């Protein structure tokens, strides 16, 4: 059960990081 919690935490962190990355990419496109 412990490893299951690790899975559902790492994906959520991974998801937040991917969303931040998209924001940065969008800003570069607008600024260029």
């Amino acid at each position: 059960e412990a490893q299951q919690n690790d899975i559902k935490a790492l994906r959520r962190e991974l998801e937040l990081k991917k969303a931040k990355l998209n924001e940065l990419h969008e800003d570069v496109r607008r600024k260029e």
Binding site: Q3, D6, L10, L14, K17, K18, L24, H25, V28, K31
Partner: protein
């Protein structure tokens, strides 16, 4: 069982994404001077 390998894949991918995020912050900070 197989979740033990899933945690490795997810951990390594998360760390690599941080490296991409870091480089992108320098890129936008570099263009902001040129503006």
């Amino acid at each position: 069982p197989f979740a033990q390998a899933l945690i490795n894949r997810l951990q390594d991918e998360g760390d690599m994404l941080a490296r991409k995020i870091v480089l992108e912050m320098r890129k936008t900070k570099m263009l902001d001077q040129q503006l």
